[PDB]
Symmetry: C2
Subunit: 124 residues, 2 copies
């Protein structure tokens, strides 16, 4: 099993890499065969290439990401609440998802699911 300390450090590093626009640092947290489903209910992206492209695309505008409560981490999984803020054409948006990671035996993320709907998308 993963330790909660490792899974919590990863979640913190994810947030910091998003804030830094550090694309390589984000992708390095994932397994080679990982999948990302964001938002929940959309079609999943699988493998390094598609995941790197997903994050490259999510970083087209500067993002401010804040973890907004403690990380929950138990049994090879972690969940966390956060916000992502950005501005486009003079309009600010703040999105507030809950993300879920599952980790493999080597401590890499094998699955990310980002759960948020239209009610979790707010004005800046």
């Amino acid at each position: 099993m993963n330790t909660p300390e490792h899974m919590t450090a990863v979640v913190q590093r994810y947030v910091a890499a998003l804030n830094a626009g550090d694309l390589d640092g984000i992708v390095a947290l994932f397994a080679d065969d990982a999948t990302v489903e964001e938002p929940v209910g959309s079609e999943p992206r699988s493998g390094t290439a598609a995941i790197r492209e997903f994050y490259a695309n999510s970083l087209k505008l500067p993002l401010a990401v804040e973890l907004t409560q403690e990380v929950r981490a138990v049994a090879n999984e972690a969940a966390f609440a956060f916000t992502v803020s950005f501005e486009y054409q003079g309009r600010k948006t703040v999105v507030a998802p809950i993300n879920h990671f599952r980790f493999n035996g080597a401590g890499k993320v094998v699955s990310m699911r980002a759960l948020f709907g239209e009610k979790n998308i707010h004005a800046g």
Copy 2:
């Protein structure tokens, strides 16, 4: 597909039924083939009898439960952050999970998974 507003009202009903110690009102939110897994990594309880027993066990102590952020709801799923406190012989414990619900076509909860570990629990 479920509505985010139906899912959100069920999360609030759940929380309200826990606070009132209303065992029937909790179990009525679940499908008769639902599974509950709390904490994540423990053996899942499946079906009405086991789900009623699971909540009867939770309700052996008085609970104070409150949502601590807005509910996330999309597709057929919801996730929520909350705290639960309870007291046994004058000693109080507070726990901060993130729960995830999946709902069926009829709007009942077909699966609840509760993520938290010892780092999210504070006794006395």
